[PDB]
Amino acid sequence: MLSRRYAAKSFVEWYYRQINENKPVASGYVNNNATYTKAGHPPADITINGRVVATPEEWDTMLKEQRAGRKPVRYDVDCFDVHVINADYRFAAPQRMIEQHAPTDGVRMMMALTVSGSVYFGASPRSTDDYVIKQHFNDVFILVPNWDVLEKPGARSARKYLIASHKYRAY
Amino acid sequence: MPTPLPQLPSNVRDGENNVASTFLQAFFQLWDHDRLTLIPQFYDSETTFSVVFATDSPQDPASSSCSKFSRNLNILSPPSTLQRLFVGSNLIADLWKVLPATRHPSLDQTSQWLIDCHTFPHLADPTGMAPYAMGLMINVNGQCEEADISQNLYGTRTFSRCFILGPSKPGAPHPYRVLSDQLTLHTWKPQPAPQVGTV
């Protein structure tokens, strides 16, 4: 499996598992990371259904707002795809990271991720037929490496790459 | 008590020059009639193109086309149902030919498009004088009229398309280029075929 696809698939799984488990997803954003903040990275660019959001916490709150035997809100990832838009990402990186890892090692890469699926409101946790209303969602992320983690042998795809940009759409 | 998120109008933060609107207008105008000309204009060696299918519609053209493409390619053997397809700079031209004939609406109709876009940092600098360069992400949600003429197949496609725009190489046609093109085809609903009578 491709290194990018693995990171992508895994991030996707975590993210939507966290949303469906009613857990905060702010951690996955570059805003809460200390290294990037120390390096002087802008806050993550989050856009929900056309509304610009200031912080991932606000987005996490919106996710709670939306939730107000049947599950209130559930996300079903139908598909996703990831591209590499920087092979040589060096921002906020220690010096060692640049010399040890090459662009062909599939670690120092800025990724453009797109995810598309459905959104079932007031439906059975396992049924895709019965629902109050069904939306179609299409997410778009820009993922950056987490320099603090790629040193640690232990691996969470959740931390392994961080969100710098987010575009949520649902209709 | 559930209530879906609020659906605001599409905010196009393409700055003061409105480059996104121009690019999109030109791109789809070209995509419809002579898409291949887009490649020398906006595409590069570093460019990458993907097509994904979010759902398995009955007898849709794109699936069959992409299937034939994947089967035809000597480069690998996958089997029956393909969810996605990925190609580098060298096979984009060969893939765009196989894709169905499409007719998109004008951007004047805001009711038909959901275009979100913004500029982000830390892209690569093709000129190589600076470490970083700034890029423009353009996520487009919309629909169009998709058609296969060889078969008698005609219908309406709902889709999402993500463009990653960045600064171009020296001696390029335009000041910018497409770094990544991610196409997602949600659904295909059959529609009546247009007919022309002559005498």
Residue numbers in the entry:
A (entry chain B): 1 to 68, 81 to 183
B (entry chain A): 364 to 441, 444 to 564
From the study:
The Mex67–Mtr2 complex (NXF1–NXT1 in metazoans and small bristles in Drosophila melanogastor) is the principal mRNA-export factor in Sacccharomyces cerevisiae. Mex67/NXF1 is a modular protein constructed from four domains: an RNA-recognition motif (RRM) domain, a leucine-rich repeat (LRR) domain, a nuclear transport factor 2-like (NTF2L) domain and an ubiquitin-associated (UBA) domain. Mtr2 is a ∼15–20 kDa protein that also has an NTF2-like fold and forms a tight heterodimeric complex with the Mex67 NTF2L domain.
The ctMex67NTF2L and ctMtr2 chains interacted through their highly curved β-sheets in a pseudo-twofold-symmetric manner in the 2.9 Å resolution crystal structure, similar to that observed in the analogous complexes from H. sapiens and S. cerevisiae. In the complex, ctMtr2 was not altered when compared with the isolated structure, with a Cα r.m.s.d. of 0.38 Å over 148 residues. More recently, the NTF2L domain and Mtr2 have also been implicated in binding ribosomal subunits and rRNA, whereby in S. cerevisiae specific long internal loops may be involved in direct RNA binding as well as domain organization to form a continuous RNA-binding platform with the RRM and LRR domains. There was clear density for these loops in the ctMex67NTF2L–Mtr2 crystal structure, but as in hsNXF1NTF2L–NXT1 they did not form an extended surface, suggesting that ctMex67–Mtr2 may not be involved in ribosomal export in C. thermophilum in the quite same way as in S. cerevisiae. The position of the pre-α1 loop, which has been implicated in the spatial arrangement of the Mex67 domains in S. cerevisiae, occupied a similar position in ctMex67NTF2L to that observed in S. cerevisiae and H. sapiens. In particular, Leu368 was buried in a hydrophobic pocket present in ctMtr2. Notably, Leu368 was positioned in a structurally equivalent position to scMex67Leu263 and hsNXF1Leu370, indicating that the NTF2L pre-α1 loop position may be conserved across species. C. thermophilum Mex67–Mtr2 retained features found in both S. cerevisiae and H. sapiens and conserved the hydrophobic pocket identified as the nucleoporin-binding site found in NTF2L domains from other organisms.
